[PDB]
DNA sequence: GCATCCGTGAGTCGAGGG
DNA sequence: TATAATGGGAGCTGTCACGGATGC
RNA sequence: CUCGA
């Protein structure tokens, strides 16, 4: 169908790779495709560079490293459940400083974890993502001390786990003090050890009025840079004794040190801008020619002593400035990683180098990869920002990579983040979404990258503008930093523009974020698009302008939850987003280059180029994801069919023709109905489940272990105690059910059989072998069954044995068995729906086709959505969405409606306008005049001055087609609603919140080892916890016995539990409760406490709950 | 061994019995009752005495003999007849097949 | 405060 | 935490009287399980109890004959419906249940002020008193329909709001 | 008969603010630093805001969620505190047998500290209804007994008498002033405010009165 | 009888004494090939009592007929193995340790 | 709403002594099998099946209908506990 | 509250206001073994000076003495009820070394020990009510006549 | 009398996931 | 069972308010 | 920790 595109702006660049943020970084520290000679100091070569010489044989020196193939390929890590890595090798060698011998080898250091194509990794089988961190960028800040306004903090920050913060501030006596490691000491102390003189420091801190006068300190001077780096370190190390080389190690490895101390590139170039110097090393000072020489201390307390005295050209700093804020992306936090498990190394090679043979050592001998492997294993495992993949749709991979995390290891504790960290800073605009972030607690701790924003080489955000000389606007794209921003003018985006030149002699602009209105003279630059002002997510919502920003957060939100179906349609009012998203997620197959297609098959497509040569493309089909829903790819493409470079060739999951579809496009109609849509339900027509509108095919993974105990092995097999044919029925000759059968609750996946543990037969159990005459097997039916509510026809079945090729299990597994378990969903009843704009509730009711308010024509509405939802919430979005849906309806055509420019309303109007002409004017061809009950509701429209006294009913009719309102006939009467409805098209999407994995139900069950209460979560089968406030609920209506049930027979009372259920099902009422057992382990973990609990009577004798068993 | 708080909650109970079990013993110890209250007193009791369901214990044919009086040989045939009686209260009634597993 | 230093404290007086 | 407890998503029945709720079959059969059991004892259902508990094990091994038997075991009988955070004490609530089709617990529109509770997404826990002194204490105090004023205010914490309100104005 | 404007009247949905948005301008926004910005959106979302006007209202937006977010921690921690220290409080009695009591003013000083001007109606029937009189009170030909309790016409009539200047304070039975150990009495407490009748001796009146006071913490802007 | 009472006080090591139902000398907890408890360990049987219900750590008596009856053999008491959760034991210190709680606790209750 | 509970509500000093009445009355009609009903054939509790009418299964429903013709005694210290209870079980063997 | 338009009825806040005045300072022990500044609960305070003055002995002269909610509560007399709530270490010890007796008598303690809690259907009050038919009611009754 | 270091708190329920 | 060697390494910190011991 | 309310 025909796609009509609104807006008058013009991108000048495209969408930059999404993904490149995940892949460029990783590529920057791996280096894999660069040369060992020709890799710069940056990434994992750092952590080499760094760690390497290791002295004190004597010497073991770094040459350079490698990284192999991998050994499995991605889709065979994700089957067996191992990582995508590369092995890394290492050239060290030997080097004896007397004997002057030198042992090169290279060394296998381990694996290390590879990124995949679209920007992920898969570790253990499972696809995760590696979150980027922002944090306070390395460098020196001024900030006004709360405690003394005039007074200001100068504070000196490194990087993450490199080192000390360190605190300038001028004491209320006088001097000038210093922070290490919260200890208060003169900074004068520290300046002496540097080399400096009352000579130098009173002709340059002179200048400052009585700032230096506070620095004047007689004692200091009277000794030599020696005896004052002696006194420094007996105040700084209190108990160690005040060696001079143990002095000068301490303070080298806090202050000159690399190798420990070291400022961030950002944080070096930081410091340079700000104290107007330049900087050797990235460290404070340096060691030099035996002694210390100063870099940062000297210009740091120079612009203090400037500050303080309101020296001009001195200002404090904004910490949640974007300039003053990085990013670390997967590169850098790989590194940290990596840069610890390689000291690691180091300490275990100096002990290494002192035991053992002095002749004869090799490099082999010296390097354990253990802490290597450990250190990197730990951060792609249980590191914070490592994440499990949203993998539910192509939309939900893309902004998972896309985060931005305030917390996380060297970030923000919870605790400390406050308004000020949350809060949208003015110069987030270009960089990151003000939109998308969480609702709660989370919020503004997490949020998304902005679409053209990128991130430089020092780890700050840059955002696009258009260069403008003399009033013309160029093709000149210029990224620039939080700071570069500041210094100019820039104008909005809308602003009018004749070809190059500025129409208006009145344009929208910003001054360091502030907006103001200027002349085209004074605009230096322009902004590219309204689109970068949003993230991804956000720019897939039409008419964003008519939404809140509120609701609009959780259409973005949403977005990320939605469900491939398989019927699913792109939106017929697009943001023009829909695309790209589709080609940067690397959901949907494409043509390498021109050429014919050879072949088109469900499996495979092959492709013959220009080149000639034949490439074959394997299709993926309905592969599990991490969420469960089902990624597969279909062919958009015809035999013989002659296609382009960059062509589509399959759609993906969630994807039409190349076009991101997350739901469907059904006819919405708005109104109240019977109560059912009340407090945001919806009402779904029943059509929508005949023609499998919103159904998705889910895949649920089930395992199983056989192992070897010391009562003998258990097995998997066919042969199952006290089990009927029926029960074996779809099971194989092994035991394991067959592919294509259908599973319900109850039924066994995998027959396991394990020998019973040593038992003691009860009297009754003798009695009853005897009578039966029946001996009691060895083994017990252990076999892995379906867990209930859950069910479907399993599509797969993989088995690992022990003995057998390219299978190595963990020790005492003899096999491992998994059965792959898909289904296909139906919408029903519970299912959660929403929309773009924000607008979610789950479904309510589904009605037969008959009782659907429908149009004159016949034609039933899909979803019948309540109008209340929309005035407290303020989106009008959805309301705009359904208008051009309702032309879009009869005119058979689709729209991009771009953000911020798009369809106004008399653009609407006149595509309104052609649909009636199509809507009712077939109706006067097909020899039919007005309803009667068309004419009802016209008159009610004249009361309500929806329409014009005196005009046609096919004018009245119109007037209100152009409100996007029409005559609504109730399916249950035939008589029509006493007023105009709104009604059209929608976008809508199923959220991956269905009522069918949620709902759970447990009458008794497993109980926790020690306290003896129900387990917690669904798929234990444990009971829901009645907690503090639940319980003061019952204690306000002032149920004791309905509490006293919850708090004994329900839950920890063993003897209470026990006799409660046998008394129901032998129709008996429920017994007295006894005192519940978790009371007891209080009493006994009190009693380790050597504090003594005793329950007493009226008369203050002891009374025993334990009744005599733990008494001697 | 892995820490318990690296976790805890996950783990289940597989030494107390659950009340469906022990409700399971309740009803089977009362069902066998049922079946040994057809007997008579004695033959009821040597059965009791034999699968040990009175002391705990079971005792030989000789300890059994020695209490009642009766000779090895005639109180393994009282057993016998007891557990032939049982088999045919079983067959008619079925009541305690269920509880076979 | 620290059991090592401590020690290593009462290590150096003999 | 208890047992004889569930949860599962809210929809609004409009049909429910105010103390009426709906409850999933499924649920029902679960909660009441030990009780479903004597009474498939009472009636021709099973032989006993175990056979009727191994009966229901599997879901193709479950008869229509259950659920009228159910019926009468649910009959004059209340639930306790829940919902967090359980700010006062009307965040519970005690209802006569109605089986429904469908994993979905049905809620009357009145109460969902008092519960704080919208339909879109919210779920609610299931809670069965079991005692007849606990079953004496639900129905008599803790009934929705015998709390129609707010302990805070004394003004009604039960009455016409959204869709109803939108009704008698119009 | 306009969709916003009967479901804003009716009481359905919205408030005048939030329709003030959909039609005339969007109104004054908040710096992040708590300032406002000089420059208010002139645009509706029926019109719709531009994009440097969608940012600028973000900062708020922002700032009003994290604000929420922050607050319920911190009403969640208010609400357990009152239970634990009001959780003994039952009514275990009848009568505590106290001739003491508090008086409720139904006269507030103004502002400009002029006069002496009524209290606002919803503050007297707070410290009213419900309550049990200590004292005999005449007013309007009326006589209220003391020991009853006070019915929302009560309340209303005692408003009445103190327009026409005869009573300005209502002796009432209250928990401050009740020597019930361990609790209150049935008499101090009074009205059972769900069954607008005198309250049941062994109701927990601790856990209402704190779940009461806790429930609308997330409500306090 | 009916509590109407809880009391919390100070245990005295007589008290403490009086708990045990042993002193536990090794730092052991189960054996390891055998996976059973170790003898005069944490998990010891001879202590806290029987593993399984009614029955001993070699098994010689395995019946509810013996209760109360400690075996020669093994020395583990024959009874219910859930005072497993129940009987406390006790550690001998060679010299006397100071309660953290009561020194800590600011201020410090034996200071 | 339960029928009548507004009286109920009046027959009582105390919300909560309602429960406890009815409460103990249901667990009475339990033990005894329903034989001590003070109701009339026709004042009945019934529950309808897929046959037709039977007996309500519920105690408390019973209890509360009872309770509305004034033909039950409660309060304080009526009868001794243990004494109340054989005299039942002599009238109403269960 | 009536700032942001919610209704709450004032005995609310004097449930809670009330718990907040329930401790005093001693001013002076008089003939009492009370000490100067120690802090009790005023009716333990009143219950000691009614005694001591129908001893004819001298009165307690105590101050009223006002704490916020969270130090009222682990001020309580029970210590279930304190070491439950917060700052556990510390309300144990005081409590383990005076020897401290819990009466059971707030909701919290019962609660913990998973007893009936002293309100509502568990309220001594109404708990020891019986239920008796006319047809059992006279049955004793003449069980009792012929005795 | 009054600054300062220490210890103690900082919402509920339910999924998933390592 | 015997060259002789004799004082550790770890360290990123963006909140608030309370009582209370600690010091000038 | 990430989500749902
Ligand atoms: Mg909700
Ligand atoms: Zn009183
Ligand atoms: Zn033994």
């Known amino acids: 169908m025909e796609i009509k595109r609104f807006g008058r702006i013009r991108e000048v660049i495209p969408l930059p790779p999404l993904t490149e943020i995940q892949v460029e970084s990783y590529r920057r520290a791996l280096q894999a495709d660069v040369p060992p000679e020709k890799r710069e100091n940056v990434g994992i070569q750092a952590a080499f560079r760094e760690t390497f010489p290791i002295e004190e044989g004597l010497v073991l020196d770094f040459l350079e490293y490698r990284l192999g193939e991998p050994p499995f390929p991605q889709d065979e890590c994700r089957e067996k459940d191992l990582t995508y890595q590369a092995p890394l090798y290492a050239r060290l060698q030997l080097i ?1017 | 061994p892995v820490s318990l708080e690296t976790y805890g909650d996950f783990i289940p109970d597989e030494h107390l019995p659950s009340p469906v079990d022990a409700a399971t013993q309740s009803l089977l110890s009362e069902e066998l009752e049922k079946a040994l209250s057809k007997l008579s007193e004695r033959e009821a009791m040597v059965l009791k005495l034999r699968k040990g369901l009175i002391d705990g214990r079971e005792h030989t044919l000789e300890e059994v003999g020695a209490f009642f009086g009766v000779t090895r040989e005639r109180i393994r045939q009282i057993e016998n007849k007891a557990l032939r009686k049982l088999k045919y209260h079983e067959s008619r009634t079925r009541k305690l097949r269920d509880f076979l597993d | 405060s620290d059991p090592v230093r401590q020690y290593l404290h009462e290590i150096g007086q003999v | 935490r208890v047992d004889y407890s569930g949860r599962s998503v809210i929809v609004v029945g409009p049909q429910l009287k105010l103390h009426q709720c709906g409850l999933p079959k499924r649920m029902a059969l679960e909660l009441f399980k030990p009780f479903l059991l004597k009474k498939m004892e009472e009636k021709g259902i099973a032989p006993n109890v175990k056979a009727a508990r191994r009966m229901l094990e599997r879901q193709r091994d479950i008869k229509d004959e259950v659920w009228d038997a159910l019926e009468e075991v649910i009959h004059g009988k209340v639930v306790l419906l829940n919902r967090a955070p359980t700010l006062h004490r009307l965040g519970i609530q005690a209802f006569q249940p109605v089986l429904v089709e469908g994993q979905s617990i049905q809620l009357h529109p009145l109460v969902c002020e008092a519960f704080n509770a919208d339909f879109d997404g919210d779920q609610m826990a299931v809670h069965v008193p079991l005692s007849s002194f606990a079953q004496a204490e639900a129905r008599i105090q803790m009934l929705s329909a015998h709390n129609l004023l707010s302990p805070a205010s004394g003004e009604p914490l039960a009455k016409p709001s959204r869709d109803i309100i939108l009704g008698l104005y119009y | 008969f306009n969709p916003l404007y009967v479901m804003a009247q009716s009481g359905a949905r919205g408030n005048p603010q939030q329709i003030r948005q959909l039609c005339g301008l969007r109104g004054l926004m908040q710096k992040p630093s708590g300032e406002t910005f000089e420059v208010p959106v002139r645009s509706s979302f029926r019109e719709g805001l531009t994009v440097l006007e969608y940012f600028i209202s973000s900062h708020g937006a922002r700032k009003g969620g994290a604000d929420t977010a922050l607050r319920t921690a911190d009403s969640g921690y208010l609400t357990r505190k009152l239970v634990d220290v009001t959780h003994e409080i039952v009514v275990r009695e009848a009568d505590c047998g106290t001739t003491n009591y508090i008086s409720v003013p139904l006269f507030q000083p103004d502002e400009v500290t002029r006069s002496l001007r009524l209290r606002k109606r919803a503050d007297i029937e707070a410290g009213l209804y419900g309550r049990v009189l200590a004292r005999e009170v005449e007013v309007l030909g009326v006589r209220l007994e003391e020991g009853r309790y006070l019915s929302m016409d009560d309340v209303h009539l005692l408003i009445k008498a103190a327009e026409a200047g005869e009573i300005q304070e209502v002796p009432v039975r209250s928990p401050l002033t009740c020597q019930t150990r361990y609790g209150v009495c049935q008499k101090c407490y009074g009205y059972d405010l769900s069954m607008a009748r005198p309250v049941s001796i062994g109701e927990a009146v601790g856990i209402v009165a704190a779940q009461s006071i806790g429930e609308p913490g997330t409500q306090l802007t | 009888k009916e509590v109407r009472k809880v009391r919390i006080a100070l245990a005295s090591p007589e008290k403490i004494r009086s708990w045990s139902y042993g002193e536990v000398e090794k730092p052991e907890t189960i054996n390891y090939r055998t996976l059973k408890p170790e003898r005069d360990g944490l998990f010891d049987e001879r202590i806290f009592g029987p593993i399984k219900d009614y029955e001993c750590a070699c098994g010689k008596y395995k019946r509810q007929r013996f209760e109360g009856k400690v075996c020669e053999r093994c020395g583990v008491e024959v009874t219910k193995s859930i005072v497993r959760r129940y009987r406390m034991g006790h550690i001998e210190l060679a010299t006397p340790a100071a309660h953290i709680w009561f020194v800590k606790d600011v201020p410090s209750k034996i200071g | 709403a339960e029928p009548g509970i507004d009286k109920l509500f009046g027959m009582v000093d105390s919300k909560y002594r309602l429960t406890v009445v009815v409460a103990k009355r249901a667990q009475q009609l339990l033990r005894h099998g329903f034989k001590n009903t003070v109701l009339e054939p026709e004042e009945r509790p019934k529950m309808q099946t897929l046959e037709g009418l039977f007996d309500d299964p519920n105690a408390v429903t019973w209890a509360m209908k009872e309770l509305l013709t004034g033909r039950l005694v409660f309060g304080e210290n009526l009868v001794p506990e243990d004494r109340l209870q054989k005299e039942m079980e002599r009238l109403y063997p269960v | 509250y009536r700032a942001q338009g919610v209704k709450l009825h004032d005995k609310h806040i004097e449930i809670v206001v009330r718990q907040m005045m329930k401790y005093v300072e001693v001013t002076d022990p008089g003939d009492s073994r009370l000490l100067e500044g120690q802090v009790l609960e005023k009716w333990d305070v009143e219950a000691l000076n009614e005694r001591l003055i129908a001893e004819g002995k001298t009165p307690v002269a105590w101050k009223p003495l006002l704490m916020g909610v969270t130090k009222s509560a682990l001020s309580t007399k029970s210590w279930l009820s304190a070491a439950s709530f917060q700052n556990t270490t510390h309300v144990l010890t005081e409590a383990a070394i005076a020897g401290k007796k819990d009466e059971l008598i707030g909701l919290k303690e019962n609660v913990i020990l998973g007893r009936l809690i002293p309100a509502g259907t568990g309220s001594d009050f109404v708990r020891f009510t019986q239920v008796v038919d006319q047809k059992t009611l006279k049955a004793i009754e003449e069980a009792r006549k012929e005795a």
């Open chain 1, 96 to 1112: 004896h400083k007397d004997t002057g011998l030198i042992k090169e080898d290279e060394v296998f250091l381990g694996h290390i974890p590879l990124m995949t194509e679209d920007g992920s990794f898969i570790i253990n089988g499972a696809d995760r993502v590696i979150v980027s961190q922002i944090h306070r960028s390395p460098g020196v800040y001024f900030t006004p001390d709360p405690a003394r306004p005039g007074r200001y903090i100068a504070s000196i920050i490194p990087l993450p786990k490199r080192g000390p913060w360190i605190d300038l501030e001028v004491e209320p006596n006088g001097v000038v003090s210093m922070k290490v490691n919260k200890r208060k000491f003169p900074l004068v102390l520290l300046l002496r050890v540097l080399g400096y003189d009352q000579e130098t420091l009173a002709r340059e801190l002179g200048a400052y009025g009585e700032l230096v006068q506070g620095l004047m300190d007689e004692s200091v001077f009277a000794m030599r840079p020696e005896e004052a780096l002696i006194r420094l370190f007996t105040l700084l190390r209190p108990g160690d004794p005040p060696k001079r080389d143990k002095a000068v190690a301490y303070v080298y490895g806090l202050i000159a040190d690399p190798r420990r101390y070291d400022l961030g590139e950002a944080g070096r170039y930081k410091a340079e801008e700000k104290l107007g110097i330049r900087l050797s090393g990235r460290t404070l000072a340096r060691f030099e020619d035996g002694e210390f020489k100063d870099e940062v201390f000297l210009p740091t307390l120079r612009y203090l002593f400037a500050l303080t005295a309101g020296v001009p050209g001195h200002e404090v700093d904004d910490i949640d400035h974007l300039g003053n804020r990085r990013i670390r992306t997967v590169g850098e936090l790989m590194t940290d990683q990596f840069r610890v498990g390689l000291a690691r190394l180091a300490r275990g090679v100096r002990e290494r180098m002192l035991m053992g043979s002095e002749d004869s050592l090799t490099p082999a001998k010296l390097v354990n990869s253990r802490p290597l492997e450990a250190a990197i294993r730990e951060f792609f495992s249980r590191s914070q920002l490592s994440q499990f993949k949203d993998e539910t749709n192509p939309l939900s991979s893309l902004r998972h990579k896309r985060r931005i995390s305030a917390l996380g290891p060297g970030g923000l504790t919870r605790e400390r983040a406050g308004f000020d960290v949350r809060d949208v800073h003015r110069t987030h605009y270009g960089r990151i979404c003000p939109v998308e972030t969480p609702e709660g607690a989370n919020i503004g701790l997490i949020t998304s990258l902005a679409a053209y924003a990128r991130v430089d080489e020092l780890g700050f955000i840059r955002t696009p503008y258009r260069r403008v000389v003399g009033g013309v606007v160029t093709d000149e794209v210029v990224y620039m930093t939080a700071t570069e921003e500041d210094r100019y003018t820039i104008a909005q985006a809308n602003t009018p523009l004749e070809g190059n030149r500025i129409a208006a002699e009145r344009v929208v602009a910003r001054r360091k974020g502030e907006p103001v209105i200027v002349s085209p003279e004074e605009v230096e630059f322009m902004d590219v698009s309204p689109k970068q002002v949003f993230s991804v997510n956000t720019n897939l919502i039409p008419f964003l302008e008519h939404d809140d920003a509120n609701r609009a957060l959780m259409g973005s939100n949403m977005q990320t939850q939605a469900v491939p179906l398989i019927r699913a349609q792109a939106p017929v009012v697009m943001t023009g987003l829909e695309e790209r998203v589709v080609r940067d997620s690397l959901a949907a197959l494409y043509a390498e280059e021109d050429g014919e297609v050879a072949k088109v098959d469900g499996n495979r497509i092959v492709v013959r180029y220009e080149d000639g040569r034949l490439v074959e493309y394997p299709l993926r089909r309905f592969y599990r994801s991490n969420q469960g829903t089902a990624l597969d790819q279909r062919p958009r493409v015809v035999v013989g069919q002659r296609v382009r470079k960059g062509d589509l060739l399959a759609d993906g999951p969630a994807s039409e023709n190349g076009f991101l579809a997350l739901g469907q496009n059904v006819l919405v109609a708005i109104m109240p109905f019977d109560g059912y849509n009340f407090e945001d339900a919806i009402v779904i027509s029943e059509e929508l489940l005949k023609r499998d509108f919103y159904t998705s095919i889910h895949i649920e993974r089930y395992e199983i272990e056989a192992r070897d105990t010391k009562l003998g092995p258990e097995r998997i097999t066919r042969d199952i105690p006290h089990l009927s044919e029926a029960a074996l029925r779809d099971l194989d000759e092994e035991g394991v059910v067959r592919i294509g059968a259908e599973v319900k609750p109850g039924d066994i996946l995998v027959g396991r059989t394990s020998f019973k543990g040593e038992s003691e037969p009860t009297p009754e159990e003798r009695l009853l072998r005897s009578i039966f005459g029946e001996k009691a097997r060895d083994v017990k039916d252990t076999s892995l069954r379906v867990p209930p509510g859950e069910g479907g026809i399993v599509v797969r079945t993989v088995r690992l044995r022990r003995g057998d090729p390219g299978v190595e299990l963990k020790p005492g597994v003899r096999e491992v068995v998994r059965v792959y378990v898909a289904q296909k969903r139906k919408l029903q009843v519970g299912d959660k729906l929403a929309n773009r704009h924000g607008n979610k509730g789950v479904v309510a009711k589904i009605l037969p086709v008959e009782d659907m308010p429908h149009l004159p024509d016949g034609t039933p509405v899909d979803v019948i959505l309540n109008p209340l939802g929309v005035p407290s919430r303020m989106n009008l979005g959805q309301i705009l969405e359904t208008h051009l849906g309702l032309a879009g309806y009869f005119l058979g055509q689709r729209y991009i409606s771009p953000i911020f420019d798009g369809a106004k309303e008399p653009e609407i109007k006149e595509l309104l306008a052609q649909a009636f002409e199509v809507y009712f004017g077939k109706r006067k061809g097909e020899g039919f005049g007005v309803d009667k009950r068309e004419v009802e509701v016209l008159r009610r429209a004249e009361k309500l001055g929806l329409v014009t006294p005196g005009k046609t009913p096919e004018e009245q009719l119109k007037e209100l087609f152009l409100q996007g309102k029409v005559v609504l006939y109730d399916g249950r009467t035939g008589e029509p609603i006493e007023g105009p409805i709104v009604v059209g098209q929608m976008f809508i999407m199923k959220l991956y919140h269905m009522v069918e994995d949620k709902m759970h139900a447990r009458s008794t069950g497993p109980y926790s080892l020690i306290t003896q209460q129900p387990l917690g979560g669904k798929a234990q089968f444990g009971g829901q916890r009645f907690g503090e406030m639940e319980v003061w609920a019952l204690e306000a209506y002032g149920a004791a016995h309905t509490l006293q049930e919850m708090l004994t027979l329900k839950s920890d009372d063993i003897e209470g539990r026990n006799a409660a259920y046998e008394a129901i099902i032998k129709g008996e009422d429920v017994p007295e409760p006894s005192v519940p057992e978790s009371f007891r382990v209080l009493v006994k973990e009190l009693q380790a406490l050597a504090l003594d609990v005793q329950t007493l009577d009226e008369k203050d004798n002891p009374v025993d709950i334990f009744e005599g068993l733990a008494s001697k």
